[PDB]
RNA sequence: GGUGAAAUUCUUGGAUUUAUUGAAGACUAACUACUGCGAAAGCAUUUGCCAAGGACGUUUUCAUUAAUCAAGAACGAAAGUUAGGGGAUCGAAGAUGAUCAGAUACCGUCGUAGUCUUAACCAUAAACUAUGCCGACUAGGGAUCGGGUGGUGUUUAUGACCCACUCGGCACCUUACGAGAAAUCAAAGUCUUUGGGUUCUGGGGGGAGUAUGGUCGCAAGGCUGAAACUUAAAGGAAUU
RNA sequence: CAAUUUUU
C-alpha cells in the first residue's frame, strides 16, 4: 500500500541534509539543510539541528503524498573519517517518529581503493 | 639544534667563501 | 679510435653558439640521421630525407613518420588509443 | 612449446631455408610444413599458401616476424620463411593444432 | 565523419563546417579531441589545441591520428641562416627590427637620449590601426604560466 | 638506549613495507605499526529498536549492522585509546585486553 | 513561488517479467506539454530496488538490482535488465582476517549484441579437526582455479540470452556450479558472483519490449 | 566552506547536493599477519612472453676447482637537475583568512616546481637489526613458511588437513650455566682458564666532514682530508 | 584555539 521514497542522508561534519526523491532517484523533493533550522552554523551537525530538520522533511513530503521511505545514510565518505555524523541517528529517529514508515535501509558510503593522496601532507594533521 | 641546521649553515657559507675564486682570481 | 671525448656528434661547430644548446642538439641530432630499423623489411637501412619523411634504402617504401625520430612519444599512444577503441565499437 | 619443437629439427630433420629453395622444395609436392614470418610482404605471402592448397601442407603462421626467426633457428641472418621437407625425428608435423 | 565515431578518438583535419574541404588542426603535429555527442540537434563538444572549447555539427569530416612532425620547435636553430633559410618560402617577416631603437617617426615607441617606451605597452582594441603596437589588448603580464584544466 | 625488544613494529628482514593513512589526523605511517582495531556495533540509536520495529515495513528487516576499521598515528593513539602507558614488566605481554 | 509539486505525473514503474509479480513502485515526473514533452523525458534512469520485493525472499535482502528503463506507454513504462551488485554490508560481513580472496573476471560477448563484465569472489574455511587459523592455499591453486573460474562462466553465458540467465542468477545455480569444479583442488567456503556491470546496449529495442510482461 | 570558534572561496548565471554518462592521470584498499621474495634499496589488481634465483630430492657428475679483499668495478629510496610527453590529487616558494605582541609559523582556503612516464644525470638517507663475511660446537619449548619421509587417519583414486620426523628459513617464549657497565643477549656465547680464518674502522670533545691540494660531476655536491687555536669534560647505562 | 619570560 505504501509508496516508497528514498531519503539519501548526507550525514557529515559541520552540517547534515537529506532529500526525499522517487524510487528511480532523480526527481528531488524538499532538501532542508543544516542552515535552515538554526542560525549558529556551529551546531548544524549537532542532533538538535537534525531533530528540527527531519520532521520538516517528512511534513514537506506529507502534502506531497510520501508514505514510506527507503532511507540511505551515508558518511562523510571519500577520504575522510568514514563515520556517520552526530545527527545521523537524529534524522533517522525523528523521521520514524514524525509519522513516516521506514523500510529496506543500509548505507552507501563510497569505499575507495585507497589512493589520490589525502590532504594535510606527510606529517599528518598537526593540531 | 638539530644538526641538519648546523649543516645548512656551513654548506652555504662555504660557497660564499668559494665564490671569491671567480671574482678575485 | 674514439677521437674526442665528450662532444662528438656536433663537434663541427667549434667553440661558438653556447654549450647548453649544443648538448641538447647533441642529444637530438644523433637521432636525426642514425640508421633505424623499419619493421616491414627486416633490415635497418632507413634514414632522413626531410623533416617528416623517412625512407628505407632497400624495399623502397617511405613511411611518413615523426619529425626527428621515426615515431614520436605521442605516436605510440594514439595507435593504442584506437586499438583500445576499435573493439568495443564493434564488440 | 613450439620453440622447444622447431629447435629439435636441426638434428636430422631435412629442412631448407630461403625463399626460392622453399618454393623449389614445395615444387615437387614432397615437402611439407611451410613456416612463415609475420612481417613478410603480404604479396609475397599469398603464393606460398596458394600452392599449399594444392599440396595440402600445413602452414603454421609464426607469431614472430622475419628478424626474430633468425635466432629462433640458430643461424645469424634474417631468415624469412622455412620449409621442413623432412623431420625424421620431431613432434611438429602431427601435434601442431 | 565524427558523428560516426565514438568517444575519445584523438583526431585531426576535422572541419568547422560540413562540406568546406579542411580547416582545423592540420598544423605540424597537433591533434584535436572529441568529448561526446549531444544527440538531439546533433552537435558535439570538442576541445582545441589551445583549450578553447567549440561546438561543431555531426557530419563534419575528420581523420584520426595526430599530424606528423612531432617535437620540431624544441631544437634550437643555432644559426642566423637556418632562420633565414626557414623564412625563405614564407614571408619577408625576417628580421624584425625593434621599435624602440627606431627613429621617433617610424614607430610609436622610439626616440630619446635613452631607449624607453614611456607610454604603456598594452593598448586596447578601442585603439585603432596605425598605433596598436606594444601589446594587443590584454590583462595578465608577468612570469607565470596560464595552464589549461586548472584545479 | 633500547626500550622495545621486538624493536619498532613487528618487522625483521623486510626493509620497507608500504605506507598507509591515519584516519584521525590524516597521517601516513608504516603499515605494520600503528593499530588495526575494528569497529562493529549496529546502525541504531541508544537502541530505539522498538521505535524501529513499529516504523519498519517488511517487519524489523535487519538489525542493521556496520563495519569500519581505524588507522591512527602515534600522537592521537594514546590521546584517544585509553591506555596511555604500560608498566615495565607488562610491556612484554601480548594481551588482547 | 509556484510550489511546483503540482506539476508532476504521479506515475508508476514496472518490473521485467522473469520474476514474481511486477508492480514494483511509483514515480513523479512532469507534464507532457510542448517543447520536448514528458513522454520522451526520462529514458535512461535506473531503479535501485533490492530483490526482497521482486521475489518475496527474506534471505536475499542483499543484491540490490538496477533497472534499464526504455519506453513509456499509457500511464505505464516497461523495463529491461541492467545488472546487480551486492549491498555494501554483505561484502564486509564475510571478508575477515586469516583467509584469502580470489577475484577473476572474464567479460563475454553474449548471444545477442551485448557485452558485460562479470565478477566472482571466493572464501576459504578449514574442515574441522583443524588447528590452524590462517587457511591458505598454496598460491598456485589460486593461480589454478582463478583461470578455471574464467571458463565456468563461459559455458552458461555465450548462448541463451540473459533474459533467462536472470532465471539462473536468482537461484544462484552458477554459484552452485563453482562448488562442483573446485571440489577437489582446495574446497572453499560459500562462493558468490558479487558483480555484473553492463556496457553494450545496442539500440532502442522495441523488439524486446513485449517479452518483459505478459 | 572550514575549524575550538569564525573569516576566505563559491552560490537564484541554478551552488552544496540527486541521477545519467564520459574523460584525465595518479594509485593498488577490505585479504595484509610475529608471514612470503630479493645481495641491498625495494617489492602488492589480473593474463601472456622472456630469461633468472632459492629450497629439497638423488646411490648422477668434476675433483680443491675454495673464504675474505687494497686498486678497479655493476646496483643503489626520496629530493634535485637537463630535455620532451602527460599534468588528476597533494603541495616547498608565494598568495590569502583566523592566531597572538610579532605569524611572510602551527590552523584555514588556493596554487607554479616536484609528484607520473622516456632518455641522461647525480651515489647520498636512522641505506638501523645503530649487530662486517665464513666455519665448528653449546640449554630447552611451542609455533610458522617452503621442500621431503611415514602413519590401519577424516573428507571427496584424488587435494587440503591431523599426528610423528627432518632440512633450510623469518621470528617468538622460558631459563640461565655463560657474557658483560647496565639495559640486555642463544648470540653481543665458547676472551687474562687471553690465538678457528678474514676485510675495514676509532684514540677526548671541539675546528669539521672546514682550509689548501687532487679527482668525479652540467650544477647542486660527493670521495680523500689536516693544521692553528681551545679545554676538562663531553658522554653511555642505571637507582632515588 | 591561544599559556611566553622568569636569569652563575
Ligand atoms: Zn625497409
Ligand atoms: Zn588520521
UniProtKB/Swiss-Prot annotation, chain C:
Modified residues (Phosphoserine): 39
Zinc is among the record's keywords: yes
Protein origin, superkingdom: Eukaryota
Annotated GO MF terms: structural constituent of ribosome; zinc ion binding
GO biological process terms on file: cytoplasmic translation
Zinc finger (C4-type): 38-59
One Pfam entry name: Ribosomal_L37ae
Record InterPro entries: Ribosomal_eL37/eL43, Ribosomal_eL43, Ribosomal_protein_eL43, Ribosomal_zn-bd
Subcellular location: Cytoplasm
A Gene Ontology term for the protein's cellular component: cytosolic large ribosomal subunit
UniProt keywords, alphabetically: Cytoplasm, Metal-binding, Phosphoprotein, Ribonucleoprotein, Ribosomal protein, Zinc, Zinc-finger
Family indicated by similarity: Belongs to the eukaryotic ribosomal protein eL43 family.
UniProt function note: Component of the ribosome, a large ribonucleoprotein complex responsible for the synthesis of proteins in the cell. The small ribosomal subunit (SSU) binds messenger RNAs (mRNAs) and translates the encoded message by selecting cognate aminoacyl-transfer RNA (tRNA) molecules. The large subunit (LSU) contains the ribosomal catalytic site termed the peptidyl transferase center (PTC), which catalyzes the formation of peptide bonds, thereby polymerizing the amino acids delivered by tRNAs into a polypeptide chain.
Note: Present with 44600 molecules/cell in log phase SD medium. There are 2 genes for eL43 in yeast.
NCBIfam families on file: eL43_euk_arch (TIGR00280), PRK03976.1 (NF003058)
Name of the protein: Large ribosomal subunit protein eL43A
Lineage, broadest ranks: Eukaryota, Fungi, Dikarya, Ascomycota, Saccharomycotina
Name of encoding gene: RPL43A
Curated annotation (Swiss-Prot), chain D:
Biological process annotations from GO: cytoplasmic translation; negative regulation of mRNA splicing, via spliceosome; rRNA processing
Keyword Cytoplasm: yes
Source taxon at top rank: Eukaryota
Cross-link (Glycyl lysine isopeptide (Lys-Gly) (interchain with G-Cter in ubiquitin)): 14, 45, 75
Gene3D superfamilies in the cross-refs: 3.30.1330.30
Described function: Component of the ribosome, a large ribonucleoprotein complex responsible for the synthesis of proteins in the cell. The small ribosomal subunit (SSU) binds messenger RNAs (mRNAs) and translates the encoded message by selecting cognate aminoacyl-transfer RNA (tRNA) molecules. The large subunit (LSU) contains the ribosomal catalytic site termed the peptidyl transferase center (PTC), which catalyzes the formation of peptide bonds, thereby polymerizing the amino acids delivered by tRNAs into a polypeptide chain.
Family label: Belongs to the eukaryotic ribosomal protein eL30 family.
Protein name: Large ribosomal subunit protein eL30
Curated annotation (Swiss-Prot), chain E:
Record's function text: Component of the ribosome, a large ribonucleoprotein complex responsible for the synthesis of proteins in the cell. The small ribosomal subunit (SSU) binds messenger RNAs (mRNAs) and translates the encoded message by selecting cognate aminoacyl-transfer RNA (tRNA) molecules. The large subunit (LSU) contains the ribosomal catalytic site termed the peptidyl transferase center (PTC), which catalyzes the formation of peptide bonds, thereby polymerizing the amino acids delivered by tRNAs into a polypeptide chain.
Major site of localization recorded for this protein: cytoplasm
Full-sequence range covered: 103 to 253 of 254
Protein name in the entry: Large ribosomal subunit protein uL2A
Entry keyword set: Cytoplasm, Isopeptide bond, Phosphoprotein, Ribonucleoprotein, Ribosomal protein, RNA-binding, rRNA-binding, Ubl conjugation
Subunit structure: Component of the large ribosomal subunit (LSU). Mature yeast ribosomes consist of a small (40S) and a large (60S) subunit. The 40S small subunit contains 1 molecule of ribosomal RNA (18S rRNA) and 33 different proteins (encoded by 57 genes). The large 60S subunit contains 3 rRNA molecules (25S, 5.8S and 5S rRNA) and 46 different proteins (encoded by 81 genes).
Top-level taxonomy: Eukaryota, Fungi, Dikarya, Ascomycota, Saccharomycotina
Modified residues (Phosphoserine): 57-58, 147
Organism: Saccharomyces cerevisiae (strain ATCC 204508 / S288c) (Baker's yeast)
Cellular component terms per the entry's GO annotation: cytosol; cytosolic large ribosomal subunit
Curated annotation (Swiss-Prot), chain G:
Source organism superkingdom: Eukaryota
Gene Ontology MF terms: structural constituent of ribosome
Keyword tags: Acetylation, Cytoplasm, Isopeptide bond, Phosphoprotein, Ribonucleoprotein, Ribosomal protein, Ubl conjugation
Subcellular location: Cytoplasm
One CC-aspect GO term: 90S preribosome
Major location category of this protein: cytoplasm
Post-translational modification: N-terminally acetylated by acetyltransferase NatA.
Biological-process GO terms, alphabetical: cytoplasmic translation; maturation of SSU-rRNA from tricistronic rRNA transcript (SSU-rRNA, 5.8S rRNA, LSU-rRNA)
UniProt family annotation: Belongs to the eukaryotic ribosomal protein eS1 family.
Subunit structure: Component of the small ribosomal subunit (SSU). Mature yeast ribosomes consist of a small (40S) and a large (60S) subunit. The 40S small subunit contains 1 molecule of ribosomal RNA (18S rRNA) and 33 different proteins (encoded by 57 genes). The large 60S subunit contains 3 rRNA molecules (25S, 5.8S and 5S rRNA) and 46 different proteins (encoded by 81 genes). eS1 interacts directly with uS11 and eS26, which form part of the mRNA exit tunnel.
Note: Present with 92400 molecules/cell in log phase SD medium. There are 2 genes for eS1 in yeast.
Identification of the protein by name: Small ribosomal subunit protein eS1A
Organism (species): Saccharomyces cerevisiae (strain ATCC 204508 / S288c)
Lineage of the species this protein comes from: Eukaryota, Fungi, Dikarya, Ascomycota, Saccharomycotina
Gene (UniProt): RPS1A
Shown chain mapped onto the complete sequence: 20 to 233 of 255
